[PDB]
Short mmCIF file of C-alpha atoms and ligand atoms in Angstrom, two decimals:
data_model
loop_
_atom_site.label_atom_id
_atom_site.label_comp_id
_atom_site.label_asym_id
_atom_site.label_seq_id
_atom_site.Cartn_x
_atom_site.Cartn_y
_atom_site.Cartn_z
CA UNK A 1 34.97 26.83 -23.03
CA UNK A 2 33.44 30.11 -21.16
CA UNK A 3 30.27 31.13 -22.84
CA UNK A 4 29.03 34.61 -23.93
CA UNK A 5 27.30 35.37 -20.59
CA UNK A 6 30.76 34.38 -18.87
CA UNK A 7 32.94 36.08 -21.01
CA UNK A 8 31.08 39.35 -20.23
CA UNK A 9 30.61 38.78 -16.81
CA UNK A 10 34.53 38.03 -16.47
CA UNK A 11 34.71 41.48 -19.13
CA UNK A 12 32.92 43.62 -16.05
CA UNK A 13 35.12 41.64 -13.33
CA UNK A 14 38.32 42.12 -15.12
CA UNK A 15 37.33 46.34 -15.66
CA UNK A 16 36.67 46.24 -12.11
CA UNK A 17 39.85 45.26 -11.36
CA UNK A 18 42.01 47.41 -13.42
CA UNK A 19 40.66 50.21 -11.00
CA UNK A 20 40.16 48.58 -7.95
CA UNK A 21 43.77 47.60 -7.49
CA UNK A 22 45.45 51.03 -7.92
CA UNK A 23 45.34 52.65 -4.38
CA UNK A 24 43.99 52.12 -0.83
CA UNK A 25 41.82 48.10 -1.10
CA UNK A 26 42.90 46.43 -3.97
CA UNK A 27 39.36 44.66 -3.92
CA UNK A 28 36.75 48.11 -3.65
CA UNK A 29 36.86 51.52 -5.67
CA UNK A 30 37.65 54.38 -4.25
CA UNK A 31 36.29 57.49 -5.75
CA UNK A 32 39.40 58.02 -7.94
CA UNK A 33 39.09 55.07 -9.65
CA UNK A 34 36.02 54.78 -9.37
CA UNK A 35 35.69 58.29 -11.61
CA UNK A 36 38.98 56.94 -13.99
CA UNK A 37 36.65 53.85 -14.85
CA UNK A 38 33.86 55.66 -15.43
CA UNK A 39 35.50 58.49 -17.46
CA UNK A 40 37.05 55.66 -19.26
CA UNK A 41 35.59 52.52 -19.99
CA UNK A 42 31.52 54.60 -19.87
CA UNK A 43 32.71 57.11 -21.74
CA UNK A 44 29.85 56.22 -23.98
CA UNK A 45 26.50 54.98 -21.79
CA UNK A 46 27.28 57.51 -19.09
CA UNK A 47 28.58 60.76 -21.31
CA UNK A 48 26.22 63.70 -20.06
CA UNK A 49 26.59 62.22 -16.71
CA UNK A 50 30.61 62.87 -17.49
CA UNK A 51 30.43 65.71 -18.02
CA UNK A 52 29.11 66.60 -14.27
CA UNK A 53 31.91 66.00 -12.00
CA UNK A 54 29.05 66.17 -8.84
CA UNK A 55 26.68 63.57 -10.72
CA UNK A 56 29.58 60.96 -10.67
CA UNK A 57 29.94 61.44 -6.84
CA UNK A 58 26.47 60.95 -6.46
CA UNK A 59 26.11 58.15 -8.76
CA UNK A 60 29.06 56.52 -6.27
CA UNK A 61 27.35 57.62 -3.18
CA UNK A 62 24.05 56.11 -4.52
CA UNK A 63 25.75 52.49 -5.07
CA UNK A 64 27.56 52.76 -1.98
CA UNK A 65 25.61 50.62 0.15
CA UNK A 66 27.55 50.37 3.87
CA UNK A 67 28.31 54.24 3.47
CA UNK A 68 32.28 53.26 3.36
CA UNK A 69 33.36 55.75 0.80
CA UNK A 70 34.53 52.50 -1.31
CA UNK A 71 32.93 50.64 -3.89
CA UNK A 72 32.77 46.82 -3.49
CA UNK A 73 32.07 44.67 -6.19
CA UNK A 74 28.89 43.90 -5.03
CA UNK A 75 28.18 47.28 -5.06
CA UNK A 76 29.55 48.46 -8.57
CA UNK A 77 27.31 45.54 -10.28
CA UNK A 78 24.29 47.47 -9.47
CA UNK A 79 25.47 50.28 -11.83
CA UNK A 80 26.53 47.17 -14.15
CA UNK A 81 22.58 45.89 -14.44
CA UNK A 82 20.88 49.51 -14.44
CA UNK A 83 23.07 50.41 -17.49
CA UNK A 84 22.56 46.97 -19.06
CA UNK A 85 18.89 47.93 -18.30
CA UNK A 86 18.80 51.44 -19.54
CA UNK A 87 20.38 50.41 -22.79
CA UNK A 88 17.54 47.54 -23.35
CA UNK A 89 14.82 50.56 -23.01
CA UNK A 90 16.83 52.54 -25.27
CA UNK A 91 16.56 50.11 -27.92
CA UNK A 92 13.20 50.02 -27.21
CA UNK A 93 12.40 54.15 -27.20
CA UNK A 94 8.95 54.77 -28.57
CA UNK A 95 8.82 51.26 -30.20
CA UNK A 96 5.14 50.82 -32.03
CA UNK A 97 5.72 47.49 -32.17
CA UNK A 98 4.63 44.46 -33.32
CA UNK A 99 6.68 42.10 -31.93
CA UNK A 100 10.30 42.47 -31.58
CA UNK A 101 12.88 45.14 -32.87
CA UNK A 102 15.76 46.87 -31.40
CA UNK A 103 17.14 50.29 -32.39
CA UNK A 104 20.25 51.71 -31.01
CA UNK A 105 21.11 51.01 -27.55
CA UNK A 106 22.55 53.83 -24.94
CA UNK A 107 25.91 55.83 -25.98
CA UNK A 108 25.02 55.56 -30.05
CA UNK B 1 32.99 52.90 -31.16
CA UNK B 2 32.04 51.31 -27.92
CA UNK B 3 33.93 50.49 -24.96
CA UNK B 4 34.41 46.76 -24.44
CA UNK B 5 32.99 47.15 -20.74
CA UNK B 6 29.99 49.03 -22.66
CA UNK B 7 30.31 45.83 -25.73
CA UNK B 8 29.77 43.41 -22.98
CA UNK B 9 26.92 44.82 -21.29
CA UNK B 10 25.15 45.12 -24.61
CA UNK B 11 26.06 41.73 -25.07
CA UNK B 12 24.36 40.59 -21.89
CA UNK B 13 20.83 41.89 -23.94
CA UNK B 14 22.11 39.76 -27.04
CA UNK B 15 22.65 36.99 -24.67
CA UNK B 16 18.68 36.73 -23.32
CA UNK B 17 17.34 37.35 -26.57
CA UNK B 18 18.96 34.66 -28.24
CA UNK B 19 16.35 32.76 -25.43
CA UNK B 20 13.45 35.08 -25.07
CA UNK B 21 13.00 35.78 -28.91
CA UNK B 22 12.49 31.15 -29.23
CA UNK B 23 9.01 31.47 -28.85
CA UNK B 24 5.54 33.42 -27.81
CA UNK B 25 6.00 36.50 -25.69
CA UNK B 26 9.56 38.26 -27.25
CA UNK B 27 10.63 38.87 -23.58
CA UNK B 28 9.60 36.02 -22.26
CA UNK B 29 11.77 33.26 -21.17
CA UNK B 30 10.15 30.15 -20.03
CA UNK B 31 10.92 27.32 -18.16
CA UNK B 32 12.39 25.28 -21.31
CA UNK B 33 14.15 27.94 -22.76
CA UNK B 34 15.91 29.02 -19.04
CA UNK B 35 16.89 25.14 -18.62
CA UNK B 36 18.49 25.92 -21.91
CA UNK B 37 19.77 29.26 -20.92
CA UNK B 38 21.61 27.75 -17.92
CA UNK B 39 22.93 24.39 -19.50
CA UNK B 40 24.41 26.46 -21.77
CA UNK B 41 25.74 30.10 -20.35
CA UNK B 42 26.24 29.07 -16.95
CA UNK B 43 28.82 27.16 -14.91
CA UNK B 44 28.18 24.20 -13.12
CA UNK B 45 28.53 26.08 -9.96
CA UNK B 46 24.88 28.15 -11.12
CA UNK B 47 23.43 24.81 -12.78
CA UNK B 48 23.78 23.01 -9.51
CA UNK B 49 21.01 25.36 -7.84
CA UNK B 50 18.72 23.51 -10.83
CA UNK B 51 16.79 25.30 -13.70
CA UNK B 52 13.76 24.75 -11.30
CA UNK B 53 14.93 26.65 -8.43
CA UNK B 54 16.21 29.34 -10.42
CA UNK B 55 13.08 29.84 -12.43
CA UNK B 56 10.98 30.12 -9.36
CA UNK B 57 13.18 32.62 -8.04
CA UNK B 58 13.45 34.44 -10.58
CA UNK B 59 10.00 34.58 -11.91
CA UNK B 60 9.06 37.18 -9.38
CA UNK B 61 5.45 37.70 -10.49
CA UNK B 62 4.93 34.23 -11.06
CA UNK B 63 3.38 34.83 -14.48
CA UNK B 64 5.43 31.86 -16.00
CA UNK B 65 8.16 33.48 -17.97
CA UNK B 66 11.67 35.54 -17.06
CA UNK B 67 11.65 39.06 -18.46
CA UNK B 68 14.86 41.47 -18.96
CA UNK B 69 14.72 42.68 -15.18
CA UNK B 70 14.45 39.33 -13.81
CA UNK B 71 16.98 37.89 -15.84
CA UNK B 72 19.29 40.73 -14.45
CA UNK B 73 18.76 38.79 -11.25
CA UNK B 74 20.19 35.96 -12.49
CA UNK B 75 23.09 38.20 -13.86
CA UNK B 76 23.83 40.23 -10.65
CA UNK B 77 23.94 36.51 -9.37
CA UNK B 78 26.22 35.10 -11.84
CA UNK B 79 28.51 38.55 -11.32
CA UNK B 80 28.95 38.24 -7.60
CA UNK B 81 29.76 34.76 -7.71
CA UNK B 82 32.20 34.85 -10.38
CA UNK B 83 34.28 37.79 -8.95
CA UNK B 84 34.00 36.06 -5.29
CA UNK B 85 35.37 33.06 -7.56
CA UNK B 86 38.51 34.89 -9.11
CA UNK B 87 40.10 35.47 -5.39
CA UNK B 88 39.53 31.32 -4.59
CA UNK B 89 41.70 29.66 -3.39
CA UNK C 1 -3.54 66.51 -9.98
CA UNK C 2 -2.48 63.08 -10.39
CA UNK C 3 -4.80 60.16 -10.15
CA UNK C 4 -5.39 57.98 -7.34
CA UNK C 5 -3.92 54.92 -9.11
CA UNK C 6 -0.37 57.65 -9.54
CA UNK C 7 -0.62 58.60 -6.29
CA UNK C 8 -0.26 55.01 -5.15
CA UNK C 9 2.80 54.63 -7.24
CA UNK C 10 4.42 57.24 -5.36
CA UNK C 11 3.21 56.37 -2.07
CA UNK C 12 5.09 53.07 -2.95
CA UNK C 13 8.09 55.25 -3.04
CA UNK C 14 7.58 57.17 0.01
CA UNK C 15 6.92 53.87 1.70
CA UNK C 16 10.46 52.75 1.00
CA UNK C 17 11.87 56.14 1.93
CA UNK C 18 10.34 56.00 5.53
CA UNK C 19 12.74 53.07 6.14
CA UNK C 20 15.65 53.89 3.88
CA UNK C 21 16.13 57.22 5.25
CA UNK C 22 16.51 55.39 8.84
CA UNK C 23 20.46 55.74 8.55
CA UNK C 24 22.96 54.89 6.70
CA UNK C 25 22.95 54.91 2.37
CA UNK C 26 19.47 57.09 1.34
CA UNK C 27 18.46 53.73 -0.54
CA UNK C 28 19.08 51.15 1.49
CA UNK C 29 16.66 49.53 3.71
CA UNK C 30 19.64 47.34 6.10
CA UNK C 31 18.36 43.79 7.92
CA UNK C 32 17.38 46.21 10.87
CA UNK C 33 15.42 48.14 9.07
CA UNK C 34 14.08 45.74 7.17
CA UNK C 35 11.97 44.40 10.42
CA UNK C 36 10.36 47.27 10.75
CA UNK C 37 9.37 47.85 6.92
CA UNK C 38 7.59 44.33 7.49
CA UNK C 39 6.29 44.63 11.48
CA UNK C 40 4.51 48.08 9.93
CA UNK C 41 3.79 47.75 6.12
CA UNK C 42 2.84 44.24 5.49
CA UNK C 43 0.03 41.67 6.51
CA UNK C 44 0.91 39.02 8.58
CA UNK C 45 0.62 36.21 6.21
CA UNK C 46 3.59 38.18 4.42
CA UNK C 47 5.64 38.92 8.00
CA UNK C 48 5.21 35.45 8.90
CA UNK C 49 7.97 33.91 7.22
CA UNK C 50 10.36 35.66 8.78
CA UNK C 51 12.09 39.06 8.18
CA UNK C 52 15.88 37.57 8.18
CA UNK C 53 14.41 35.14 5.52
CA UNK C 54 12.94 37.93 3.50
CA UNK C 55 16.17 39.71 3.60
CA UNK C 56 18.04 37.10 2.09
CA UNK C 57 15.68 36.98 -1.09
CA UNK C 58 15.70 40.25 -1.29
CA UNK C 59 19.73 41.27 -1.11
CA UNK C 60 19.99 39.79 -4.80
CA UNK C 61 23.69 41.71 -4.73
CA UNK C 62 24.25 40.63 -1.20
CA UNK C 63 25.80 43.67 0.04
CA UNK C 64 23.80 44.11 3.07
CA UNK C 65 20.79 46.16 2.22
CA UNK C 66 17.89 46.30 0.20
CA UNK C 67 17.56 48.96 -2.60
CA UNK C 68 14.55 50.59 -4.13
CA UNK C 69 14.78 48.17 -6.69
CA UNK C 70 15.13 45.31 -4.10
CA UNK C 71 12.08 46.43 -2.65
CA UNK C 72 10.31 46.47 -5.88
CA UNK C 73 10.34 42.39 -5.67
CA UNK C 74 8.56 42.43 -2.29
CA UNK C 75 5.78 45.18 -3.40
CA UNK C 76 5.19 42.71 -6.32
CA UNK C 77 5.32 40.04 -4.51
CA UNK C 78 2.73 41.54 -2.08
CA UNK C 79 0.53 42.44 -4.58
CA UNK C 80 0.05 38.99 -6.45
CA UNK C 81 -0.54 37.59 -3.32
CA UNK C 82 -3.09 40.04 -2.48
CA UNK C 83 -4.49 40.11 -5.69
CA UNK C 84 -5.14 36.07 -5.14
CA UNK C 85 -6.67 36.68 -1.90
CA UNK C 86 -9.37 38.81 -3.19
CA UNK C 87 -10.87 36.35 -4.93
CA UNK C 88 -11.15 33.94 -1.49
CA UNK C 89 -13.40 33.46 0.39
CA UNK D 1 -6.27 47.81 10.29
CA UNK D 2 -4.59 48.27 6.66
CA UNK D 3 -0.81 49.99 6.57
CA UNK D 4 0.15 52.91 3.70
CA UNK D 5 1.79 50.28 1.93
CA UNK D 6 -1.11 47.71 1.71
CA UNK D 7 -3.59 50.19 0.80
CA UNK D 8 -1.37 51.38 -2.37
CA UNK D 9 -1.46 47.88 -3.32
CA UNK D 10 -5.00 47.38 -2.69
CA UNK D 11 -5.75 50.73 -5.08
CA UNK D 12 -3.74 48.95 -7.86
CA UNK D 13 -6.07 45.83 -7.45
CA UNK D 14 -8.98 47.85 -7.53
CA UNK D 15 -8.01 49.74 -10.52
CA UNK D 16 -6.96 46.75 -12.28
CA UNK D 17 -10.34 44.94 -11.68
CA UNK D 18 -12.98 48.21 -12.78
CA UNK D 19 -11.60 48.01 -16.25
CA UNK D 20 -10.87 43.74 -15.86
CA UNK D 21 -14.63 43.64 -15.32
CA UNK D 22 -16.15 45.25 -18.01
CA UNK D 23 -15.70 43.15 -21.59
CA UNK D 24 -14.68 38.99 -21.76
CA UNK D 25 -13.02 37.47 -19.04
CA UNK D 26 -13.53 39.50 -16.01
CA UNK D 27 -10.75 38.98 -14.39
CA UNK D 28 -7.94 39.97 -17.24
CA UNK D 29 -7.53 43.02 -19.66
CA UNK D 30 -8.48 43.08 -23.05
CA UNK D 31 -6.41 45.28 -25.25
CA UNK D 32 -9.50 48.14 -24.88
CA UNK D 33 -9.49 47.53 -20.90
CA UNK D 34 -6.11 48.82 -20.96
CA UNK D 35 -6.07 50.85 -22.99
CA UNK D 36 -8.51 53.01 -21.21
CA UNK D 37 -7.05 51.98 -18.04
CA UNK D 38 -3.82 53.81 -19.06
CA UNK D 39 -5.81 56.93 -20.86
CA UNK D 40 -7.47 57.41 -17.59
CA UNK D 41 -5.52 56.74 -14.33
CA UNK D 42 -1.98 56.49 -16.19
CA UNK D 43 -3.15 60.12 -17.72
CA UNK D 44 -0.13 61.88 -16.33
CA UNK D 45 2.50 59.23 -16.05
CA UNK D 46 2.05 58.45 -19.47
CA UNK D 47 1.10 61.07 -21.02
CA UNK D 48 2.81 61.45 -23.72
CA UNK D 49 2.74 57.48 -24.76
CA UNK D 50 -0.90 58.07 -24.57
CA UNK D 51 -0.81 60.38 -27.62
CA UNK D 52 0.59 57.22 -29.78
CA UNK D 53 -2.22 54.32 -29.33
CA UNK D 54 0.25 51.99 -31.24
CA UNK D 55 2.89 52.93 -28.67
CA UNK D 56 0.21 51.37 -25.85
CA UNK D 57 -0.54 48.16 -27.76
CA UNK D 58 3.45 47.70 -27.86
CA UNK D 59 3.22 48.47 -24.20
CA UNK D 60 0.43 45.75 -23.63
CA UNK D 61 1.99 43.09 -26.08
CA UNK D 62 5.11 43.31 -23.97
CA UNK D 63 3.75 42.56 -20.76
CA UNK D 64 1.52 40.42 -22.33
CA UNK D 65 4.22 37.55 -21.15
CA UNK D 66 1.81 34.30 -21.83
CA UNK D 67 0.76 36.23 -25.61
CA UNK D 68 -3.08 35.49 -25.16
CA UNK D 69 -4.23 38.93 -26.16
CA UNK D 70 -4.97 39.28 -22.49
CA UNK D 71 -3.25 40.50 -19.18
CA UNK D 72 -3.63 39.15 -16.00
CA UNK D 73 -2.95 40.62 -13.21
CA UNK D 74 0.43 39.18 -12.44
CA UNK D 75 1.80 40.80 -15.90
CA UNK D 76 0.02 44.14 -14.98
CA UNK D 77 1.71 44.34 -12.04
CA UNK D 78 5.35 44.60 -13.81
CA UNK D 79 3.79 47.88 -15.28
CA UNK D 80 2.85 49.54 -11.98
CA UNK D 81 6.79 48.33 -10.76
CA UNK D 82 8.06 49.70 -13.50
CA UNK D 83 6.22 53.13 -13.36
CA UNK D 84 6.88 53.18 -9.47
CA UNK D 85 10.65 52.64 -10.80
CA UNK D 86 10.41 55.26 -13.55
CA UNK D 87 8.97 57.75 -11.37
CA UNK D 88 11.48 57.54 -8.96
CA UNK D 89 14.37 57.73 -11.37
CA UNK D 90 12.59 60.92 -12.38
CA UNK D 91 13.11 62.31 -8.70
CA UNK D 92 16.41 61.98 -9.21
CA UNK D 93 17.14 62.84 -12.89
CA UNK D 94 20.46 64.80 -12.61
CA UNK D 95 20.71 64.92 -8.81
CA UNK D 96 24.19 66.01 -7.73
CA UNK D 97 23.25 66.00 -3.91
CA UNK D 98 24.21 66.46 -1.30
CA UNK D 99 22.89 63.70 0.30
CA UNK D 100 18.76 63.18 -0.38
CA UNK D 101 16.46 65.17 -2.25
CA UNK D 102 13.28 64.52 -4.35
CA UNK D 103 12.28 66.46 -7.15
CA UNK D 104 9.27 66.17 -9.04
CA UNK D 105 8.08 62.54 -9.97
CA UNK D 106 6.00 61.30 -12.95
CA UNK D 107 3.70 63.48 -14.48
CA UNK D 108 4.56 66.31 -12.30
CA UNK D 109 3.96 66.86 -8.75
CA1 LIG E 201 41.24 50.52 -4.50
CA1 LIG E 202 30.93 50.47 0.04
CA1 LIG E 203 7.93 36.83 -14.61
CA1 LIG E 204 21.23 44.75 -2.06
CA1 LIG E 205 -11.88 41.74 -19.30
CA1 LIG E 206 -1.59 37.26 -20.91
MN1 LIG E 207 38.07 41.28 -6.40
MN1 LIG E 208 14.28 43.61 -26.55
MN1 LIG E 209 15.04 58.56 -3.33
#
């Protein structure tokens, strides 16, 4: 019954989750699991950025919106669109066009 | 290979292009095709709002179409709502 | 040196950054600040509506503030409507 | 009268119309207007898209959002957002803080 948008959407919900409910709020990241996700399941999109311990925090910092050290789900879906983003203008690196192709996206 | 959290957000670009890349500008959505779009990706908790609504709001530059970014409004949208959704009720 | 049109660009950001560097998260301009960002940077047709109003579109993740991206939808917003006013009379 | 904020917009107008003016419709961008709108004041920001003229026509179809050869104003202004964006992602390319810190922008400086 779900479509393909849902099904992703509930894909990024369920991810959340996994994480979220470990320690402390089962409903917001801290920055444990917030780093175990990311290490994890953006292995891929985010691998340089991995590989920077001090990047990660800031990338959590930077979504952290109410400065509460935790990462709400309102908050984490920000990192959800700018990746979705950033692997649209991958596929699109140094296109010459015409019209409409897409090469690989971020992580390949 | 990648992750399925990575698989779906790739599949979130599949999912607009199967409606920008109908006609004219390839990311373009217009009003037609984001009736379509919502009828049939969204729940009847987003279609309520009407394709109307949504398409002014979301066509920020009022040029007449949705592009990627402002389709990631709809998106951040659909996310919040669902995950408020999954603790109800 | 950059041009006058880059320079803009970046005074856009620097714009934001008087406001989101208020308090709080580096970008986020909160409903507070938010006021002020209007009361100072824009013309009154654009105030005039209301700044809690203007928050609300704004806060597409509604988690209390508005990013730099969030603020991107008001500059562009500004700027159509300014761009339309230039050619009245 | 005019705040920082307005007059950045009102430079983008302005720049927008002394190219919009020149060839057709005088009031939208021909795929010349642009293109020597961007080899001129995008010099920097894009410089090195500038070196591939095919890579700017892909840049102008794109925006081109109604795909009548022409840009209005309303679709140029999702370039100057996104350059505003990409410059200050550039500020921050590999910032590991503490707390707030700019580096160098688009095009340097
Ligand atoms: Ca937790
Ligand atoms: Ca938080
Ligand atoms: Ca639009
Ligand atoms: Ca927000
Ligand atoms: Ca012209
Ligand atoms: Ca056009
Ligand atoms: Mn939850
Ligand atoms: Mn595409
Ligand atoms: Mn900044």
């Amino acid at each position: 019954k779900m479509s393909q948008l849902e099904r992703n959407i509930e894909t990024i919900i369920n991810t959340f989750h996994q994480y979220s409910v470990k320690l402390g709020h089962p409903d917001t990241l801290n920055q444990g699991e917030f780093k175990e996700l990311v290490r994890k399941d953006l292995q891929n999109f985010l691998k340089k950025e991995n590989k920077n311990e001090k990047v990660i925090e800031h990338i959590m910092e930077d979504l952290d919106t109410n400065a509460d050290k935790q990462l709400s789900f309102e908050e984490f879906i920000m990192l959800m669109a700018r990746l979705t983003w950033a692997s649209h203008e991958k596929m699109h690196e140094g296109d010459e066009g015409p019209g409409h192709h897409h090469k690989p996206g971020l992580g390949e | 290979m990648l992750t399925e959290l990575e698989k779906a957000l790739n599949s979130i670009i599949d999912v607009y292009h199967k409606y920008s890349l109908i006609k004219g500008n390839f990311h373009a959505v217009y009003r037609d095709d984001l009736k379509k779009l919502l009828e049939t990706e969204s729940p009847q908790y987003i279609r309520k709002k009407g394709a109307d609504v949504w398409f002014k709001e979301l066509d920020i530059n009022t040029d007449g179409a949705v592009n990627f970014q402002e389709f990631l409004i709809l998106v951040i949208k659909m996310g919040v709502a669902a995950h408020k959704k999954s603790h109800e009720e």
